């Protein structure tokens, strides 16, 4: 899904002249990226603690 | 493209599952050799008795 979002931004870069607005959808896309990052942090932390107890 | 994606997905699932089973199978074999030499030594000493 991260790759899909990146591709969607990439296609969005194809817009033209006065039809390139800060459509709040793009703000939501940025928050999409940051949500993914937070999830990844949580996952890796849990993996680490599992390793120590192993 | 939609179907092509889930094709790859099921392939990946298969990969993961098969690798896990392989690991534990080879573990069991590694243990059974030890059992084998145990019984062989037992045979030797009972013959001596």
């Amino acid at each position: 899904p991260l790759d899909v979002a990146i591709e969607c931004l990439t296609l969005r870069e194809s817009r033209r002249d006065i039809d390139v607005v800060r459509d709040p959808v793009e703000e939501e896309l940025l928050k999409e990226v940051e949500v993914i990052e937070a999830t990844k942090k949580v996952l890796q932390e849990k993996i680490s603690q599992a390793f120590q107890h192993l | 493209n939609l179907a092509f994606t889930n094709r790859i997905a099921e392939t990946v699932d298969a990969k993961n599952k098969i690798h896990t089973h392989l690991t534990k199978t080879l573990q069991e074999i590694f243990q059974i050799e030890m059992t084998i030499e145990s019984i062989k030594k037992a045979i030797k000493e009972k013959s001596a008795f």
């Binding site: 899909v4 969607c8 969005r12 194809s14 033209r16 039809d19 | 889930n6």
Partner: peptide
């Protein structure tokens, strides 16, 4: 002309999120 191009681009980027419907499955019933 420019407006039509914008519309077509929007539909194009819309469609791809059928990918995010898992491996085209239900997961939860």
């Amino acid at each position: 002309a420019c407006k039509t191009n914008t519309l077509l681009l929007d539909t194009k980027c819309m469609d791809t999120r059928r990918k995010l419907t898992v491996p085209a499955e239900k997961f939860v019933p």
